[PDB]
Amino acid sequence: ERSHSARMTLAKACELCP
Amino acid sequence: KTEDRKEYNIGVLRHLQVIFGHLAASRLQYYVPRGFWKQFRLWGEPVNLREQHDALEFFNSLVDSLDEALKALGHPAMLSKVLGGSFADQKICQGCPHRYECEESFTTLNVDIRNHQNLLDSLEQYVKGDLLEGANAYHCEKCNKKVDTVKRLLIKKLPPVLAIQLKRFDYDWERECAIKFNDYFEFPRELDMEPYTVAGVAKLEGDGSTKYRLVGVLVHSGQASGGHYYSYIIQRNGGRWYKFDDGDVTECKMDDDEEMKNQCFGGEYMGEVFDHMMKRMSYRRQKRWWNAYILFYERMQDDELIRYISIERSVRKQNVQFMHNRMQYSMEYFQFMKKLLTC
């Protein structure tokens, strides 16, 4: 929020969280 | 082996008869068709219980076997007289007054869905028919020449119950697999055959009810290869619709037109997607893979169906067995034990 490949990483992680 | 097929046809009738008796009087929630799965073979080949297949292929095989069994037992064709009809293929030439007409028997109505939006529109396609012209012009056998001819299909005999297939399936050669179409389509609760019959076209051109009421909606939800089948069916009561899926029988609110659209009408919708622990909002166009497949229309206990032309034991015992076991595991029984032991 404050950085391109990280965008897919966060999206893939945001479904991985409990 | 004609003798084997005759017993095969009759055996299906006996197995199917049992199913009617059970659903009429079995006190359990649902029935497990042990014999029906074992007896029925699709086009002779055995039916795989773990394999998805087109319902029409099962439908076509079933309606034929019962008709054969009835004929083998001296009864007429119950379903063909009540559900089956007869097309009146008409060939009218424009350059010559020659007219060709022939009759074609059928079981269900197939209507184009990709190029039509409502069941009415796909139905004048039969009345309007097709025009053959140019190199495709129909070759008149009497004239021995090619002449423009309007080839149209009209219903000659009106069965008391009308079967309509909603063509939503085809094959994709690029994908090398069966594909499903979820095109938005329409159909009314009360449907009229009169403008679309032979008499109606003759009445309009200038030389026995025709109205039908929808009672059954077969719906598919899933992929063409797999998917699920379930029905929405009206109850003939003296004073409604119900939801039939597998072993479950419940009520439904699809009598409303909005729920009519959401479930059976199918089609596109601009769906809303909820994700990212309810922090990200997105809009995605979605296909209603749940949509109608086959429709049944009823016109507004026949002795002729009983007249010749050419068991309740399994029901009772499964009633008794269940209601014996239903009492064993009843919560009031366990409380009777607790009182009996602790008294």
Give the DSSP per-residue string, B265-279: I--EEEEEEEETTTT
Three-state SS at B114: coil
Question: How many other C-beta atoms lie within 10 A of the C-beta of residue B158?
Answer: 19
The secondary structure of residue B136, as a DSSP letter, is G
- Do the annotations mark residue B96 as ligand-binding? yes
How far apart are the C-alpha atoms of B261 and B230, rounded to whole Å?
16
d(CA B99, CA B343): 93
Which tokens in the block code for residue B297? 């229309």
B75 belongs to the catalytic site: no
Structure tokens at B305: 């169906």
Q: How far is B281 from chain A (nearest CA, A)?
A: 14
What span, in angstroms and rounded, lies between the C-alpha atoms of B161 and B83? 5
> Which residue in B75, B116, B220, B228 is the catalytic one?
B228
The type of residue at B259 is E
The answer on whether B264 is annotated among ligand-binding residues is no
**Cα B69 to the chain's mean position, in Å?**
21
Partner residues linked to B178 by β-bridges? B171
Q: Which residues of B touch A15 (CB under 8 A)?
A: 275
Q: Where are the alpha helices (DSSP H) in chain B?
A: 2-25, 34-39, 55-72, 78-82, 119-128, 198-205, 257-260, 313-328, 331-342
Positive or negative CA dihedral for B319, B325, B330, B332? Answer: positive
Q: In whole angstroms, how far apart are CA B272 and each of B169, B226, B260, B280?
A: 27, 26, 20, 11
E-strand stretches of B120-263: 130-132, 138-140, 145-147, 149-157, 161-166, 169-172, 177-180, 190-192, 211-221, 228-234, 241-245, 248-250
Place of tokens 């095989």: B61
Burial B102-133 (b: 16+ CB within 10 A, else e): eeeebbbbebebeebeebbebbeebbebeebe
Give the list of residues 6+ apart from residue B309 with CB closer than 8 angstroms, or none: B74, B75, B76
- What contacts B166, CB < 8 A, 6 or more positions away? B111, B113, B185, B291, B292, B293, B294, B295
- Residues from chain B that touch A17, judged by Cβ atoms under 8 A, are 277
d(CA B302, CA B214): 21
Residue B236 near residue B262 (C-beta atoms within 8 A): no
Tell me the residues of B at the A interface, defined by beta carbons under 8 Å apart. 275-277
Instruction: List the determination method.
Output: cryo-EM
Say how many Å lie between the first and final Cα of chain B, rounded: 70
E strand or H helix that includes residue B281? strand B280-287
Measure the CA–CA gap between B130 and B103, rounded to whole angstroms: 17
Scan for tokens 């893939």, then name that residue: A12
DSSP, collapsed to helix, strand or coil, labels residue B52 as coil
Where residue B64 falls (left for φ over 0; alpha for ψ -120 to 50; beta otherwise) is alpha
How does DSSP classify residue B28? S
Phi, psi of B242 (to 5 degrees): -145, 160
Q: Is B65 left (phi over 0), alpha (psi -120 to 50) or beta?
A: alpha
Q: Nearest-CA neighbor of B160 among B126, B193, B127, B189?
A: B193
Which of B223, B221, B227, B226 lies closest to B243 in space, CA to CA? B221
Taking CA–CA distances from A16, the nearest residue in chain B reads: B276
> What's CA B156's distance to the chain center, in Å?
21
